[PDB]
Each structure stands twice: as C-alpha cells, then as structure tokens.
Design a protein around this ligand. Structure first.
Ligand SMILES: [Ca+2]
Ligand SMILES: [Ca+2]
Ligand SMILES: [Ca+2]
Ligand SMILES: [Ca+2]
Ligand SMILES: [Mn+2]
Ligand SMILES: [Mn+2]
Ligand SMILES: [Mn+2]
Ligand SMILES: [Mn+2]
Lengths: 232, 232, 232, 232
C-alpha cells in the first residue's frame, strides 16, 4: 500500500501546502476565496480562482495496474447578490501536476473550448448549451459535458457539506451534497476509469468561476479533507 | 473522548461478538441471514430475524450532555421469488441493551401495534397504511411512521451498499444507499435528537421481516462497519 | 480483515463494556482501582482485582491460520505506603473468554501454583523464587516464569505510560514503559506464538495483586486503548 | 485541528512527493539509498545523502501557541564491509523548509562545525570527541552534541525497525529501535520544546554520512510512516 491523508478545519493565509492560482486567495478569517469581490462583498464578473494541494497523489500504477481509492470532503458556500441571475459554478477535481487554469465562466476554469486530462465533480449554476435545466451536480470526465448530472437544490449564503468517493474496486464514483440548515440532500453516482482518464500522479483542488458579464455568485471553500489508498 | 469501532468483511458462524435473535443466523458462507428459507432458498412468511452487536455503545452522556457521532455501513441483498409481491423490509437500528423483538411483518420487528425506545433507518418494501407509495427508505424515531422517507430504487438479488451518518453537532442523520451494479443511488437526511430518543447506552443491529401471508423477500447482511465517538 | 478498536480517557462507573472481577472497581473519579484500600487510602494485603473488556477478540483463525496484530496502551500508577516493602504487581493479559481469577499475590491472579491459557506482560514488584533481582517487566507465556524480563525503573505515585505491540508477521511482542515525569523509559521484546498459546477468541484485561502479608502497593489504571487487526 | 499523514511500504523511483539531496537516490528495487556504493556494493567514503518529504508540516502555531504531536517510523539497514571500522551514521530530522545539507561525516550532514534550526534523532556509529562510547542513539536539539543518548545494539546487514514519538502535552520525545531478527530493543526519551527549537513549518527527512577516509557503512531506508496532529 501507499497512503496519504490530510484535514483542515480552516485555511491558513499563506500556507505552504497549498497552491493558489488565478484570483484565489485565503482570508484572514481562514476562508479559501476562489473569486474576487466588492468592498460590499459583491462578486466581480469574469473572475477565476483555482486552488490545489501541493503534494501530488499517486492515483494509479502502471507496473501493478493498481488503482487508488480515495475520498474527499469540504464545507462550502456561495453568495449571490441576485439569485435570479447566477453563474457560473464551482468544481473539485484531479489533474496533471503541471496543471494550470483553462477557460473561464462556463468552462469552470477546467476546460478550454476545443479539446489537460481532468476529472471533475461540478456544482453548476449556469445553463450552458450543453447543460440541463437547473443548477446541478455532474461528473466530468475530460469534458465539460457531464456523463451524468443531478438536480442540485442550492441555497444561497447557506453552508453545504460535500462528500466524494472513489471505489477502485467498482470503479464507481459517488458524490453527495447535504445542507444541514435545510435538511436537504443530493447524491449522484457513476463509473469512471481512472487509468484511461488520468496520469499515475495527479494534483487535486478546487476551481470556480463567475459570470462572464455578470457577478453571479462567489464561491468560498471552508474546510477540507482527503484520504487515499493505493494498494499492491 | 470515548471511541469504539469495528469492521467485518464476512460473518463468522457462532461469532461471540454478536447476538442473534429470532430466525437470524450466520451461514457457512459468512452471510448474516435474517429470515428463514426453503431448501430451494425461497423465503418463509411470518419470519423474523434480528442481530445485534454485543458491546453496548455509549451514545450520550448525562453529566457532560455530550452526544456521540457515529457512522455505519454494510453490504446487503434481498431475494424475491416474485417481485410483484414483496414484503416486508429490513432495518438498522439502535435500541436499549435489554432489547428484544417486537411485532413482525409491517412492524419490522421493531415496533409493537400500540406504543422500547428505538431509532431506525428502514428499507421498506411494503405499503402499510402509514406508508407512502413505493418501497422507500425512512427515519424512524420511536415509531414505525417515518418522520421522513424517500423513494428507494430497489433491485432484487443485486448488492446494495449503505451509508449512515450521525453528526452530533448538527444532530443530523443521513442515509445513503447505492447499487454499484446499476449505477444508482438514494439519499435521505433529517434531524434526530439522540437524547430525547434513547438511553445513554444502546445496542445496534439489524432487523428484518417477511410477509405475513407471503414470502416476499429474504434479507441477508453481507458485511458490516461501525465507528463512534463521544466527546468531552 | 476483521478489526476492532476502542479508547477511553477515563473509566465510567458501572460501564457495561467492562467486566470487573475480584476486588476491582471504578471510582467516581474515573479510576480503575484494582486493589482494596484504607480510608487513608492505604492498600489492603491479600487483595486481588481483575478487569476485562466485554467483547471477546478474535486473535487467530483456524481455517486461514491468520494471526491478529494488536496494540494496546494505558496510563497507570501505584501507591506504596512503604517503598522498601512492595508487592506484588500488575499485569495486562489475554485469556480465554471463560476466564476467572487464579492465585493471588506472587501469581498476580493469573496463574495457579501447579499448571487457563494466558499471555501476559507483567509489571513485577516482588522477588519470587522464580524472579530476577529488582522490579521488572516480563513476558509470560503460560507461566509466571517470564521467558524474558527487564529492569523496570518504577516510580511510586508517578504516572507511567505503557505500550504493547504484537507483530503477527514477526510474531514479536514488544513492551515499553515510559515515565514522562522522570524522562525515563524501558523496553522489552521477544517472540510469542499466539496460536500455540491461546484460543482463537480471547478476552483482554488487567490483573493486580497486593502483598500476601503486606500492603505493598495499590494499582490504578487510568486510561486505556486497544486496536486489533486480523487478516485474510 | 490540522492533520496530515502518509505511509509507503516501498520507495518509487522518481516519486514527486520526495526530495533527494546529495548522493541520495531510490533503487529500482524500491530502496532509499542514502550513500554511494561500489559495484561490489561497498560504500564510498566522504559520501552524503539526504531525503525529505515534499509537503512541509505545520509543527507549531504562533497565534494559538498550539504544538503538534507527531509520530514516525521506518525500516532501515546498514552495510559494513568491516565492522571494526564504522562510520559515520544516519539521522531522522526536522528542519526549516529551505533546508540544505550541512557538514558531512561526523556532522551527519545536519550540522556545520560552528553554529539551520534542526531537531534530530541520531543513529551514531562513530566516536567523535563529543560522542560517548559505542554506537548509540541520541537526541539532537540544534547541536551534534546529543542532550541524551543511549547504547544502540546495532546489527550489520540486519533490519532494524524504528519508532519516534512526540507528545506535545508532555513535550516528550521518545525513540525506540527494535531488531526483530535478534529479539533486541533500545529506547530513549527526553523533553524537547518544539517552539524554541524550530519554525512553525518544517520539513522532515533522513540524513546519512560515510566515513571521511573510510567506507564505514551504507545506510538504506526501506519504508516510511508519518502522522501528525496540530490542535486548536
Ligand atoms: Ca454551465
Ligand atoms: Ca411497511
Ligand atoms: Ca514476583
Ligand atoms: Ca559521531
Ligand atoms: Mn454543468
Ligand atoms: Mn415504511
Ligand atoms: Mn516476575
Ligand atoms: Mn552521536
């Protein structure tokens, strides 16, 4: 085996175990603030933040052909000056180490218009042409066109708690989101082949975009947990 | 703190850390077989099995007024000779140590017709008068009338994987069930106050009933995991 | 695999997950008090206490021939009215489920004069004919005659912290005792074959005796931790 | 809290979560080989290897004034062409992120002749003027002059297993080394104040040197484990 794992109940400004890209930063108040905001705290359009964890993860193994199993979780929120007009979303993902930001807005900073090898779970607020009705949750295997999605019952300014799981044995990825304040929950599950989708080593992180021409909503990540196993 | 936790990938016949009630037994093949069956393997009506874990759990504390947080999981299946005619269901629960079986069939062995202090998560196959349309999943706080339920997309003879969580801090209980074979999943969540619902010490286990006049479906528990924390 | 594990930072009077034998009891003040004492708090001679954990442990497996690996720890102390005159000792051990107390004093309640299948780590204060000079630590495989022992640098009324390990793979048992207050430590290690020494299922606990004709020292167990794994 | 932790049962050549300094490298055969050797496999004098783990560790906190507790372990060996002539040693340590190698041989690559803020546990084979008789184990707080040491019963070409612990609460560091093949073990313990000794963030790793004018012994690290907690 080969294992790793970490937990933070807060973000520490300037923490060396993290890598901030784009607009992303950490507040004195221990928030991971992915997008840029007004003094009033209002979001700025055409914004983009990413955040990754420094140590790369050994997700699969060529010789052995072994596949890691992982799990992650994190508390997060959003702020929408106007809830009738949201965009663009937030995502948790896995990418090559070298990873850098891609297209914004609708592409959630993870994908570029044409065809990085990315695996992602999206929390989408905005109906692109490829999107389904309503904000939803989706699995993204090398495309902004989710292989599966599900209605997401978002709640502005309220804390959502998230759970992600990868069962190597079934090759089945599961995502669940719960809002304790509203006693509400959504889940989603599908199969993903790590191997054909990613490099043996990856980096994980968060991505988030605001509306192109609109402010839509900010995206703050409050806490974060991760564990992984890779067997013999 | 005070913690406990256990995991089994199989059941061992005659294992001393378990307590079998009613029809319940463990197969040579490491299954926990809750209800009785034909040679052909068909279920016998009016059957009832319970199974508990020996060590009692310290779920809450009077002096401190502290509340445990727990989580559990287990792989399970069902066998329905005839899928048009199912009953009665399966449940995971928490009860007083002294606990013994109650009414069968529709009462899932946990509750008696009139008004034990029981907390349960049910997997219900049968529309009682108190039930909602379709097999579902529900939270049972001292009553067979779920405070909340959700459509359960059962699949006969297929393995379902289950997850239960209790967040003391939010007092929010979450139940998720996933069927990897069908890439299908359901979740459900609501608040439950341990304190007002149960004794400081409890025992946990499984309950399962067959149709009164029908065979409906058997209920086998394949594996089992549990962890709990009780703080200062 | 098959795993279990538990931790207590205090003892709860009347806790159902424990079994008290002999003089042993739990104080309002959360101590596990193995031997009997004066109002003044002085120990009573010819005293004997044992304490076990309720759930039995699956230490080895016949079919598979698999062996568990475990580890334990606990904070403990002793009280000697007169340090020139100590007896008799304290022990942590593994026994058959059925286990009941044996001979006292020098036999630490675990062994009887002539030849239960017991494995124990002793903290011996008293030179029996079979003992070596000075209080020591020893490994006891079915005999009060340690297969190995080591000088123990005891310190009255001071808290000692203990560590026990069993590496199934090497079949090597290790015991370390440290006294933080005095920046002092002892270790001891040797091989033990679980299989030939014990039953597939065992119960673990503590034993402790006072001097036959003397008071010697009391033995209180403050905290306790245990984890075990048994593989496929 | 804030936690991290990792385990490897082998080293992967070119693994990105590690940083190799000096002569240090990883063998096809998954060894971490700290010093340089002959084709015959014999060690080369005046050699030096270091190895660190990439992610930095948050060992203590200014605001809170909280101190982490950690533990580590690793399997290691040594090869001495001639056991009458050994040098120079191996060490596990904590340093500033920026850390780079210091003086070799007797200084184990961690310290320079005159007075980096380093905390280390040494496995010393060579009697310097500051050393005590015999190979030993020692605690090094900002000096190659151990604040405490203990006889180390080394065994050439044999696998030693090591354990390191830091109890923030007692501020007591413990080191134990065991050689299963020989049923032999050594322990050592003393207090160390993280705060006054190191920066809030540190990097951990291994260091190892060969004899100045002699080959002495090689130093290979086989496996490695680490966990840390930093509280609120
Ligand atoms: Ca979209
Ligand atoms: Ca029903
Ligand atoms: Ca004795
Ligand atoms: Ca030296
Ligand atoms: Mn979408
Ligand atoms: Mn129902
Ligand atoms: Mn003895
Ligand atoms: Mn030295």
């Amino acid at each position: 085996a080969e294992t790793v794992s970490f937990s933070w109940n807060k973000f520490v400004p300037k923490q060396p175990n993290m890598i901030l890209q784009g607009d992303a930063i950490v507040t004195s108040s221990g928030k991971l603030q992915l997008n840029k905001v007004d003094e009033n705290g209002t979001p700025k359009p055409s914004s983009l933040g990413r955040a990754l964890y420094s140590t790369p993860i050994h997700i699969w193994d060529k010789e052995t052909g072994s596949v890691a199993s992982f799990a992650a979780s994190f508390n997060f929120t959003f702020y929408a000056p106007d809830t009738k007009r949201l965009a663009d979303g937030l995502a948790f993902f896995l990418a090559p180490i070298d990873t850098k930001p891609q297209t914004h807005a609708g592409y959630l900073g993870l994908f570029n218009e044409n065809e990085d090898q990315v695996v992602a779970v999206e929390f989408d607020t905005f109906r692109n042409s490829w999107d389904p009705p309503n904000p939803h949750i989706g699995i993204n295997v090398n495309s902004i066109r989710s292989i599966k999605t599900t209605s997401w019952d978002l709640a502005n300014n309220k804390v959502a708690k998230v759970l992600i799981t990868y069962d190597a044995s079934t090759s089945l990825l599961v995502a669940s989101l719960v809002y304790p304040s509203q006693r509400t929950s959504n889940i989603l599950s599908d199969v993903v082949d790590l191997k054909t989708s990613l490099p043996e080593w990856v980096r994980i992180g968060f991505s988030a975009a605001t509306g192109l021409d609109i402010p839509g909503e900010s995206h703050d990540v409050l806490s974060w947990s991760f564990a992984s196993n890779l067997p013999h």
